[PDB]
Amino acid sequence: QVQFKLVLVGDGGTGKTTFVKRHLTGEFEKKYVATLGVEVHPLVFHTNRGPIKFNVWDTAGLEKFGGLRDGYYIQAQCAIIMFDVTSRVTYKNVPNWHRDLVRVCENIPIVLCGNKVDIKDRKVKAKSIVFHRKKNLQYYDISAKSNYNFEKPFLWLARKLIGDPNLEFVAMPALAPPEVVMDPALAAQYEHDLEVAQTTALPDE
Amino acid sequence: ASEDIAKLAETLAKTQVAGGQLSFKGKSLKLNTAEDAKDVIKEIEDFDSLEALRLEGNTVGVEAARVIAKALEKKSELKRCHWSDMFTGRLRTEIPPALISLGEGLITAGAQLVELDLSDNAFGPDGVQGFEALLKSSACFTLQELKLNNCGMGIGGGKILAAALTECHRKSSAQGKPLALKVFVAGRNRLENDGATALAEAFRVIGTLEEVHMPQNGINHPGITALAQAFAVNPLLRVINLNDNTFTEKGAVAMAETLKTLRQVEVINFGDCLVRSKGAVAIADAIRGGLPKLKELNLSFCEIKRDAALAVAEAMADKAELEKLDLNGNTLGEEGCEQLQEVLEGFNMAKVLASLSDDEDADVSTFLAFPSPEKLLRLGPKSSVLIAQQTDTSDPEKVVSAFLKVSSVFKDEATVRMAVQDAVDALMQKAFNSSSFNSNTFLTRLLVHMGLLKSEDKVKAIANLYGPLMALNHMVQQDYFPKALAPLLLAFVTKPNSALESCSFARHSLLQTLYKV
Amino acid sequence: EEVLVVENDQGEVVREFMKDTDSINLYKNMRETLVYLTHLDYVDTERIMTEKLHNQVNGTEWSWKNLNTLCWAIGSISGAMHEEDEKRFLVTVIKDLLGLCEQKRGKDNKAIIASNIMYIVGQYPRFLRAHWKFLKTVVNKLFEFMHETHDGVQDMACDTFIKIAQKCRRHFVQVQVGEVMPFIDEILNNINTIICDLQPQQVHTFYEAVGYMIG
Numbered sequence: 001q002v003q004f005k006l007v008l009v010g011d012g013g014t015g016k017t018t019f020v021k022r023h024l025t026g027e028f029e030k031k032y033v034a035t036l037g038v039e040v041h042p043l044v045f046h047t048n049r050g051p052i053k054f055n056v057w058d059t060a061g062l063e064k065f066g067g068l069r070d071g072y073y074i075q076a077q078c079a080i081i082m083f084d085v086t087s088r089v090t091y092k093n094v095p096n097w098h099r100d101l102v103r104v105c106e107n108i109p110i111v112l113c114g115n116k117v118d119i120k121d122r123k124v125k126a127k128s129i130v131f132h133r134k135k136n137l138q139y140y141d142i143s144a145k146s147n148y149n150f151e152k153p154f155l156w157l158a159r160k161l162i163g164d165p166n167l168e169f170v171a172m173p174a175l176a177p178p179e180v181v182m183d184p185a186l187a188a189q190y191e192h193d194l195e196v197a198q199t200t201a202l203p204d205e
Numbered sequence: 206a207s208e209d210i211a212k213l214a215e216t217l218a219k220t221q222v223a224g225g226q227l228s229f230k231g232k233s234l235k236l237n238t239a240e241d242a243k244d245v246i247k248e249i250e251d252f253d254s255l256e257a258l259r260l261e262g263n264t265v266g267v268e269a270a271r272v273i274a275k276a277l278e279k280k281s282e283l284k285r286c287h288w289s290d291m292f293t294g295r296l297r298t299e300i301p302p303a304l305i306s307l308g309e310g311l312i313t314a315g316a317q318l319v320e321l322d323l324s325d326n327a328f329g330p331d332g333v334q335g336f337e338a339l340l341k342s343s344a345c346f347t348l349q350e351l352k353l354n355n356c357g358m359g360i361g362g363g364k365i366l367a368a369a370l371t372e373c374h375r376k377s378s379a380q381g382k383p384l385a386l387k388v389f390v391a392g393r394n395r396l397e398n399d400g401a402t403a404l405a406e407a408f409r410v411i412g413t414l415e416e417v418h419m420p421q422n423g424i425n426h427p428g429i430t431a432l433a434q435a436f437a438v439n440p441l442l443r444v445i446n447l448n449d450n451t452f453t454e455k456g457a458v459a460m461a462e463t464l465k466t467l468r469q470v471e472v473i474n475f476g477d478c479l480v481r482s483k484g485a486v487a488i489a490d491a492i493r494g495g496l497p498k499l500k501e502l503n504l505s506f507c508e509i510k511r512d513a514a515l516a517v518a519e520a521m522a523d524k525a526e527l528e529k530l531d532l533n534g535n536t537l538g539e540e541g542c543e544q545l546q547e548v549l550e551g552f553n554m555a556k557v558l559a560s561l562s563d564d565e566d567a568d569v570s571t572f573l574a575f576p577s578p579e580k581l582l583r584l585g586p587k588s589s590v591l592i593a594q595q596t597d598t599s600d601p602e603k604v605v606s607a608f609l610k611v612s613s614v615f616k617d618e619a620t621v622r623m624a625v626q627d628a629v630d631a632l633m634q635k636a637f638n639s640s641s642f643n644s645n646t647f648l649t650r651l652l653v654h655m656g657l658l659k660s661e662d663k664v665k666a667i668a669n670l671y672g673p674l675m676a677l678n679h680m681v682q683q684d685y686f687p688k689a690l691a692p693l694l695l696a697f698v699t700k701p702n703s704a705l706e707s708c709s710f711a712r713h714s715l716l717q718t719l720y721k722v
Numbered sequence: 723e724e725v726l727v728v729e730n731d732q733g734e735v736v737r738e739f740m741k742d743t744d745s746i747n748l749y750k751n752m753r754e755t756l757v758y759l760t761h762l763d764y765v766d767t768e769r770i771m772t773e774k775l776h777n778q779v780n781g782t783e784w785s786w787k788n789l790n791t792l793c794w795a796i797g798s799i800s801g802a803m804h805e806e807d808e809k810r811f812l813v814t815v816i817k818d819l820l821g822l823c824e825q826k827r828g829k830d831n832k833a834i835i836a837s838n839i840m841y842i843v844g845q846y847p848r849f850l851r852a853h854w855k856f857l858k859t860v861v862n863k864l865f866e867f868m869h870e871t872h873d874g875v876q877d878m879a880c881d882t883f884i885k886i887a888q889k890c891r892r893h894f895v896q897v898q899v900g901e902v903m904p905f906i907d908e909i910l911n912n913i914n915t916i917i918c919d920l921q922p923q924q925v926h927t928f929y930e931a932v933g934y935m936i937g
């Protein structure tokens with residue numbers, strides 16, 4: 001198969017883990033559970049050129065920089081630097097993360113992602129985002145909540161790595177299910193869950 | 206910035222030549238095993254009096270944490286512990302255990318922990334649970350500073366920390382020495398509203414706070430109102446840092462309400478707080494109402510408009526000890542900046558405000574005619590005698606002209622220089638073996654043309670003498686050159702002249718060659 | 723400075739400060755040259771000193787004589803910068819030196835670093851006069867070094883204290899902001915606890931320094 005170790009780096013409370021979870025499960029973890037160390041998540045995409053896999057190393061933004069965490073960056077092939085649109089303090093740290101990345105992996109596709117663009121009180125604006133112009137980066141506004149350009153970073157990274165500018169995602173190679181199987185031993189238990197399922201409201205905003 | 210000098214004085218006050226702080230900062234030790242921490246434990250044991258322990262920039266595993274806690278068990282005079290960023294790289298199954306072990310070690314030791322710093326450690330609710338045991342215990346009744354900057358606690362962590370602080374205060378009051386927190390630094394933890402309200406409730410119990418930092422907590426107005434109400438109770442507040450939150454307009458009004466009743470605030474950082482030019486007016490009124498001892502006030506990037514900026518400037522000017530005002534980033538017109546500067550200079554300060562740098566609103570004759578280095582080469586070996594034959598050597602003037610033309614294209618390239626030198630040798634060999642040819646006349650004309658000597662009829666001199674000097678240097682070493690013209694060349698080459706100092710190397714080499722003979 | 727231990731005709735060893743020797747002349751010439759060059763361009767001199775200080779902290783060039791030379795060079799250019807540039811430069815230098823003091827282990831290394839910090843502080847009286855909290859902290863730290871039995875620490879403390887008293891004598895008698903009483907009263911009230919561990923000549927120096935604050 002094809003694997004592209006991707007490194008997801010950004011200040012604490014920006015949405016890296018939420019971004020990865022929304023990509024691999026579709027849920028929306030609205031609780032802030034700080035990621036400790038690094039978490040490896042495989043995302044399998046299908047494109048017109050076949051299947052690809054991104055091993056997203058979601059790193060912790062609460063840690064400091066330096067060599068103590070260079071183990072994350074070893075043999076990296078693409079990076080996503082994520083900053084929070086509704087916080088300028090998080091945007092001020094993008095240069096530090098870029099420096100830390102390029103210290104270990106010199107030339108790699110790096111994508112800047114401005115998260116949380118669905119909130120009305122927006123501090124960082126499209127005019128003030130000037131860092132990506134000095135370097136050679138691609139800047140994208142994303143929102144893991146409303147699903148706004150939430151797959152553009154992966155598409156751009158795949159385009160730059162595979163080498164096909166006209167690459168785009170195809171639907172899926174989904175085939176019929178194998179067969180219906182049930183276990184009467186636990187069947188009753190399943191029914192109980194339904195008895196509780198109707199007693200809770202959907203997370204509707 | 207008075208803050209920098211205050212920090213410098215504080216750091217100076219706690220430097221000792223012996224029996225003081227023990228540090229491991231900037232060593233990147235990966236204490237991944239009990240044995241791997243042998244040096245650290247051995248150094249900790251061999252310390253007479255311990256009053257501070259820094260473990261910054263390291264990686265403490267579970268086993269190393271247990272060993273270090275066992276070592277700390279002995280130290281009973283410990284009073285501070287800066288543990289900033291000592292878990293870089295550890296997973297979720299290894300932080301709470303290490304933190305609990307360290308807390309138990311300190312508790313059994315019987316320390317006092319005048320300061321407890323855990324900044325830059327990725328804790329979350331798990332780490333908060335880990336060190337809650339230490340926070341509640343008797344080891345933190347005397348605690349005076351609790352820095353948790355960038356711990357990434359969150360809502361649950363904030364609630365747990367607030368509960369722990371309340372329980373610690375209750376126990377301390379029961380004992381007889383109530384907890385008196387002075388500095389609380391919990392920034393960049395996303396305490397958005399539940400954590401912020403819980404910590405405001407915790408503050409309301411403790412009336413001893415002096416500094417409170419909560420930058421970049423994603424707090425909105427519903428929590429900021431409660432935080433302001435909690436601040437109102439504390440009358441000794443000195444620094445109120447809430448940079449990069451979202452007050453909108455209700456939050457700013459609530460903050461002005463409390464600022465009215467506080468008479469010792471010295472620093473007010475509200476940058477990136479989206480005050481929106483109405484809360485700016487409210488804060489201006491509050492500060493005008495009386496707020497001495499104010500030294501700093503930051504409202505940068507609050508989207509303030511021109512009129513509100515002028516109002517706040519006018520209100521602030523009345524302050525006596527003002528030392529810094531920031532309004533950069535506000536939507537002030539270009540004329541607005543000039544008006545603000547004029548208003549400020551109307552007072553004594555006139556320079557207190559920070560820079561407003563971001564605002565919004567057959568061919569031998571042909572060659573001889575124009576000699577060139579490449580044209581000489583094209584003649585090949587024929588150039589050795591073609592130049593000699595063509596030139597009329599009866600009259601020394603033509604010999605000198607030919608010599609100068611040949612040597613003008615002289616270059617250090619090996620092939621060119623050899624051709625030039627052999628051509629010169631042939632030309633002079635044919636010239637010097639002529640009875641009707643006076644050598645002194647040739648030398649005088651050569652000196653005249655090079656500009657080293659003057660003439661009855663002023664013949665215009667040449668620009669560069671490098672080529673002629675190199676050719677002369679080569680010629681002096683040949684046999685046909687008379688041994689009587691050496692003194693004349695020596696005298697007129699040692700003769701000072703501007704045209705000669707341009708080419709110092711050729712002149713020096715020629716002089717050395719002349720002094721050889 | 724050139725300090726010589728000399729015993730007079732009565733067998734009393736004293737520290738004499740040679741004043742107009744050849745070494746003092748050499749130092750004065752070097753100081754004058756460096757001050758002229760700093761006036762020509764202060765940014766470059768600040769950059770050179772900062773680079774050398776950084777080479778000291780990282781350890782790639784650490785040495786007692788190197789640090790002493792760097793601190794003498796830093797102290798020689800006092801008064802050659804505007805007040806704000808000098809303030810920023812001093813904050814940077816002193817912060818870095820304090821950071822290096824904890825890093826280095828051993829009593830001798832810490833003593834050398836503290837002596838250098840105090841020498842630098844005593845050579846910039848304008849910075850001390852501008853800020854009162856820092857001056858008071860420095861004076862208290864000097865009083866703490868007077869109980870240090872390590873060789874050369876009490877002498878350094880006494881020399882720095884007499885320099886600070888001579889240069890900033892008017893900030894002790896007058897009442898400062900946040901102080902209910904003058905600092906001279908505080909020093910005089912508890913003076914037997916400060917000179918308890920000093921040798922007699924160091925006690926004489928301390929009395930002279932306190933006297934400069936009473937005139």
Ligand SMILES: Nc1nc2c(ncn2[C@@H]2O[C@H](COP(=O)(O)OP(=O)(O)OP(=O)(O)O)[C@@H](O)[C@H]2O)c(=O)[nH]1
Pocket residue numbers: 010011012013014015016017018019029030031032033034035036059060061062115116117118119142143144145146357
């Ligand atoms: N309104 C809004 N909130 C978001 C959005 N995306 C993420 N968030 C919030 O941001 C928080 C991010 O939490 P996490 O992703 O788990 O934390 P993190 O990004 O990994 O930060 P660290 O773990 O410290 O590295 C979540 O609790 C969400 O509530 C968004 O698109 N819109």
Ligand SMILES: [Mg+2]
Pocket residue numbers: 016017033034035036058059060061
């Ligand atoms: Mg995370």
